[PDB]
């Protein structure tokens, strides 16, 4: 299979799933709720055990009222819809979704090696070969997504999970949208937010390649290229365009980053005629066997400790919160088609 054939075949499967979504229904009382795995601006994700099978999953729980207040209605509908329709080795899989009077639930595959974030912060930084390994998966993953005219828009270590073989699983499709032309929503974790987004311009898939630049930088540096006290000041720095690199960055890494962290869309790698191939062929990815990575035949730079099926020792502890369900339906209209 050539990539053209693989992706055109991928587009055909996706469109079918898109047009006739499967019946992935379940009910809350079917799962035993173990422990909170992580939290974000919108949702709480819990380790759960299916009372029947004994299988573990990660259940994302969203409060309808909160989703409405934070204005994530269209985003949350996108999230579930895109998740159940995509299929790629490094996208977390959606197993069930459903809702009750109060909440929306997305029950995913449980990725048990914790966030990339927590490993990155603890180790301090990733060697360039280590960063390169994760970076290659994101590249292949954006290739897949962008061929489907999907943009991801929230790339960060907090949204990337390490599996049992030490590979990346992209989770949180909260900002994922099908965009064939342009889109306008001011969204995306601040440090990773593309300039064109901040400038309130219409933007496209190219914002993800900016975000890839920020990721790769943070992975090798141990800190992101643009940071400050308040999100305002950060945006100033992102728009300024001036990036400074640490002295230990190889010369290739510096060059790739210069071409990803390009404020001018006409120059940004992944947005040129050659497209994604400008990244795949850049000096820094010379030793990358792009196919072998897709087939997961390459040895991961490390593999997290495992101590059982429902072991959560790779995740931080979070304060456990009661899961409340109203006796009457709430936001019946806003989430009618969930």
């Amino acid at each position: 299979e050539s990539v053209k054939e693989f992706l055109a075949k991928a587009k055909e499967d996706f469109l079918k799933k898109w047009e006739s979504p499967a019946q992935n229904t379940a009910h809350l009382d079917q799962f035993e709720r173990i422990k909170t795995l992580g939290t974000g601006s919108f949702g709480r994700v819990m380790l759960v055990k299916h009372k029947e099978t004994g299988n573990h999953y990660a259940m994302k729980i969203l409060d309808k009222q909160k989703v409405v207040k934070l204005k994530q209605i269209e985003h949350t509908l996108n999230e579930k819809r895109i998740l159940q329709a995509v299929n790629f080795p490094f996208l977390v899989k959606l197993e069930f979704s459903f809702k009750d009077n109060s909440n929306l639930y997305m029950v995913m595959e449980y990725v048990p090696g914790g966030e990339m974030f927590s490993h990155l912060r603890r180790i301090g930084r990733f060697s360039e070969p280590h960063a390169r390994f994760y970076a290659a998966q994101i590249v292949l993953t954006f290739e897949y997504l962008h061929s489907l005219d999907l943009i991801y828009r929230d790339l960060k270590p907090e949204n990337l999970l390490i599996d049992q073989q030490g590979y990346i699983q992209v989770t949180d499709f909260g900002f994922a949208k099908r965009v064939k032309g342009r889109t306008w929503t001011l969204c995306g974790t601040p440090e990773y937010r593309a300039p064109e987004i901040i400038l309130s311009k219409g933007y496209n898939k190219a914002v993800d390649w900016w975000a890839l630049g920020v990721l790769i930088y943070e992975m090798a540096a141990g800190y992101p290229p643009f940071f400050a006290d308040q999100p305002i000041q950060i945006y100033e720095k992102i728009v300024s365009g001036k990036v400074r690199f640490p002295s230990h960055f190889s010369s290739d890494l510096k060059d790739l980053l210069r071409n990803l962290l390009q404020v001018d869309l006409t120059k940004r790698f992944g947005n040129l005629k050659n497209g994604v191939n400008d990244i795949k062929n850049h000096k820094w990815f010379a030793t990358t066997d792009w196919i072998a990575i897709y087939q997961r035949k390459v040895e991961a730079p490390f593999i997290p400790k495992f101590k059982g099926p429902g072991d959560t020792s790779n995740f931080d502890d979070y304060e456990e919160e009661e899961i409340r369900v109203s006796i009457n339906e709430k936001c019946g209209k806003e989430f009618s088609e969930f």
Partner: peptide, 19 residues
């Protein structure tokens, strides 16, 4: 140093989409 600057920024912990 940049690394020191990072620590004193207060944004070294988990980042949410909205702050």
């Amino acid at each position: 140093t940049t690394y020191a600057d990072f620590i004193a920024s207060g944004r070294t912990g988990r980042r949410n989409a909205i702050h």
